[PDB]
Copies of this chain bind each other. A is one copy, B any other.
Amino acid sequence: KPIWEQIGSSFINHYYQLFDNDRTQLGAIYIDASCLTWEGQQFQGKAAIVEKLSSLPFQKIQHSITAQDHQPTPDSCIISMVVGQLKADEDPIMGFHQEFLLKNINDAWVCTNDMFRLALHNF
């Protein structure tokens, strides 16, 4: 309902659609200065991100969202928190926490910061 909630919600939706069905198209939502920290490893810069995301051994991965929250920022960006479970091929379901900072740059929404962590938790 709130404008930042609708945008952030839509972005997350788009991000997981791409990640679970066409991840080599993910780079389209990043920019040169975007950063990715996947399970502790830092991939600063789009090239590194695109490379890392494409090297994931996932043959078939599926994200299931338990909860998501968004907040507008002083500089008009949107920060988001996402929790839920992921299923890669033939299992053991896992929990995950993903953080995103979105910005409108050149009149388009992109993700400048992305942080993902696996978790033995549930929400």
Contact = CB atoms under 8 A, between A and B. Distances in A.
A69 B39 CA distance: 9
Contacts of A117: 67, 69, 81, 83, 97, 123
A87 to B, nearest CB: 16
A117 B73 CA distance: 19
Interface string A63-76: 00001010111110
Contacts of A93: none
A75 B44 CA distance: 16
Nearest to A71: B35
A123 B119 contact: yes
What is the oligomeric copy number? Answer: 2
Contacts of A46: none
B79 A67 contact: no
A48 interface: no
Given A119-B123, A122-B120, A123-B120, A99 B75 contact: no
A123 B117 CA distance: 9
